[PDB]
């Protein structure tokens, strides 16, 4: 009871810059600063962009702002709070059946617009700033035009799938693996997010 620990907050440690003509990852906080920020829940670093790199004490993945909400996967964030300038912020969306959670998008971040193009030529943004062409194959599945080992997708859950116009189409959730090669991906449709809201 007196010994009972508390799980830490999710911490933004970087972002995927998509504003220029070349996408690249940027780190905003190191391991030591991340661990301390996770314990206190107070992150006073300025936030920028749409795709954040987030970390727990044991895991690192991505979070994407869509319509004023920072979305990520439940299997990464759990029910954890996210660190903010004023302290830990409680999740405003939690859906384990969709593998989806969400916080209020932090001040300074920019949001992606939900896609209404109905296009199936998608692009997956990974934590290493790779922009992978993906063809939509269903409501929540897509095939990589160039298959590659799952290692390249590890840590990219919560990242966006974009349409040709840059709209958000879904949130990267899982990789369909065949002998270690990711030929397909599963994602949370943007409409499923829009519903939850
Ligand atoms: C042939 O068999 C199969 O391949 N079958 C696959 C198949 O299972 N693949 C595996 C291959 C892993 C190996 C690495 C994959 C690489 C990248 C992957 C993008 C990422 C990712 O990056 N994570 S991460 O690194 O950021 C991390 C762990 C946060 C820090 N997702 C990812 O790792 C997924 C997490 C697990 O899945 C789910 N956990 C939960 C848990 C919940 O409460 C706790 C509630 C809902 C929920 N919902 C899931 C679908 C395993 N994950 C897979 O992707 C399909 C089968 C059909 C439906 C979906 C899964
Ligand atoms: Zn679109």
Numbering used by the authors: 983 to 1179
What did the authors write?
The NS3/4A protease is an excellent target for developing DAAs against HCV, and protease inhibitors have been a key component of most combination therapies. This essential protease cleaves the HCV polyprotein into functional units necessary for viral replication and maturation. Structurally Asp168 is a critical residue that contributes to an active-site electrostatic network necessary for efficient inhibitor binding. We rationally designed HCV protease inhibitors that retain potency while fitting within the substrate envelope to avoid resistance, particularly against D168A, which confers high-level resistance to current HCV PIs.
Inhibitors in the P4P5 series aim to further tap into the unleveraged part of the substrate envelope with a hydrophobic P4 moiety and a P5 capping group. Larger cyclic unnatural amino acids were also incorporated in the P4 position in P4P5-3A and -3B, P4P5-5, and P4P5-6. The cyclohexylglycine P4 amino acid in P4P5-6 yielded the most potent inhibitor in this series, comparable with the best inhibitor in the P4 series (P4-7), with potency of 0.91 ± 0.38 nM and 9.68 ± 0.64 nM against the WT and D168A variant, respectively. Six crystal structures of the P4P5 series included P4P5-2A and P4P5-2B in complex with the WT and P4P5-2A, P4P5-4, P4P5-5, and P4P5-6 with the D168A variant. Importantly, not only the size but also proper orientation of the P4 group toward the S4 pocket was required for better potency. When the cycloleucine was oriented away from the pocket (P4P5-5), potency decreased, while increasing the P4 group from cyclopentylglycine (P4P5-3B) to cyclohexylglycine (P4P5-6) led to a 30-fold and 90-fold improvement against the WT and D168A, respectively. The binding and interactions of designed inhibitors in the crystal structures, particularly those of P4-7 and P4P5-6, confirm the need for PIs to optimally fill the S4 pocket to be more potent.
